[model samples]
Target: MDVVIAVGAPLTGPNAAFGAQIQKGAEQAAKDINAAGGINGEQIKIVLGDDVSDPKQGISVANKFVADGVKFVVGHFNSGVSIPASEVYAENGILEITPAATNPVFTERGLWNTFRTCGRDDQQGGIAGKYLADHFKDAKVAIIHDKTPYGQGLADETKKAANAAGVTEVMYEGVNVGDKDFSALISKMKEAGVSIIYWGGLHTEAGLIIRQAADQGLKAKLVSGDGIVSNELASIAGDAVEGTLNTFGPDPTLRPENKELVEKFKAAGFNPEAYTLYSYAAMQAIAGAAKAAGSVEPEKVAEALKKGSFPTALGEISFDEKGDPKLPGYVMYEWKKGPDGKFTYIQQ
Candidate 1:
């Protein structure tokens, strides 16, 4: 028997690094499953669908995956792209389990074929918002976003929660996605007396914003969501990445059950940070569901997923009625440099 799964993400684009992490996880999952006698004697074949991080391109990726007879999908890392792409998957009876896209709207629509291994933005944003409100209660806060679904979605949720928690933001602004110059934004923050700045955007923009804030002598602390998990941000923003706070799922590497898996990734010259274990965990869920359902049908697997817990690189995970994981909540993380001169994020 042969099983085909498609992994879609921007293989070459501004957010390709994020996409690559997902791609690596899927490929590694397939490799491991195949080595372990392969999902009840079927070899899992992972097909690539690079969408370039664009919603339009994501539609194309979905079309191609359906045409290629892919039964499961694990991509379109951006929530905006994932939402639109998921429609195409539904049209063809393919199941999609995203590892990164955190917007609640992705799974809030009662779509049976869609699920996620990662936590939702509402949960993550609330955590982020509460942290800022609790830790920097006296500081003026500025909330910023890139105006995209993933960025703004996280930002809006954070704003809502923070405001409800009795902390008012001094400034809430949306910036262009590809805008490299944030001097004007920094100037505004400096003038607004913003002491705590929270950005809801990808690492490239968030990293630059923090870097520029430092260069402009703006004395504001930076905080963000999982969008800054990529270590490349350190290189992109230099020393400015240090002390920045972000929220992500529990460190997969530190889990007792994931010890060997962690070393397995490092041994392969891969850092299973960010969505790596999440992707692997999504794949595990699919396989476990298929086995439990006693059929390879996508709908049956989806049903089984909602009813049972599955084991994977991330440990035990069960899906709620909405096909969202009922895993542990997000944890705080911070960026710092090691003696090896490499900057990385560690759980705080």
Candidate 2:
């Protein structure tokens, strides 16, 4: 019998590139595992589904996977999509692992079948807040979010932590995700004497913010959460993106143990971003748990995952009681201009 793994994500929507990258990584993992003699000699089969980056679509796709009896589900990138879709997976006794959904509420729901390979928003926020506070002592800070669950939640968490760390005069605001004009916001931040601006949103909003801030002569340090850490941000923000900072999950390609896997991804013509590594890790965890349990039952695999310690491209992988990865580190990256006249993130 072949082991069926459903890779669910926004494969055909605004965040499709991200989902496609994850799918590529999952596919690569399946190929590698099958070549190495799949779990109990059952070849791993990957089924792809497009969540369209919509919660309803995500839930529908998740239910489809469940009805199809897929024991292992690999994704649904956005927290908005993952939160609702995970409920369907949970009700259907399927183990769902998210590669990029970072909202803490996903795990706080206490669903036994749900696991996240990435760090939660609060964790990344705490790290970013502490870094900013220690480095820019007593600086006037401005916080912004896109008003979505992921953006607002992470921004608020970072704001709270920043305030607690003695950074005074913090102003929190909301921005439209796809808005082109941020001149008004930039003026407000400048008038408020903001020396550092932390944006809790995706690349679309962050890029515009950076561009508008630069145009308005706001010389503050622009920072953002993991959602904005992508190559696309550089294109959107242009030269304004240089010197920007953001928090992201650890870059898995940097791990020495993943050298071979990295080469494989490159050979397959994939960029191997954060979510790619995460998706690969999620696949490994699922397959390893299935082998450990000696069955593909969701409950059994979930139990095995709770106790199993496995090595992944992102270092050793272990899940807490809530099914969140035990690894505690987040990466702080700075945008730098590349030779191609685009910006790239350099670990800072």
Top candidate (lDDT): 1
Clashing pairs in 1: none
lDDT of 2: 0.84
lDDT of 2 by residue, 95-135 (tens): 88998899999889989988978889889889888877888
TM-score of each prediction = 0.97, 0.95
User: Residue 194 of model 1: what lDDT?
Assistant: 96
- Give, for candidate 1, the lowest lDDT window spanning 10 residues: 337-346
Best by TM-score: 1
Residue pairs with colliding backbones in model 2 are: none
lDDT of 1 at 316: 83
After best superposition, candidate 2 residue 38: deviation in angstroms?
A: 1.7
TM-score result, candidate 2: 0.95
Error of 2 at 240 (Å): 1.4
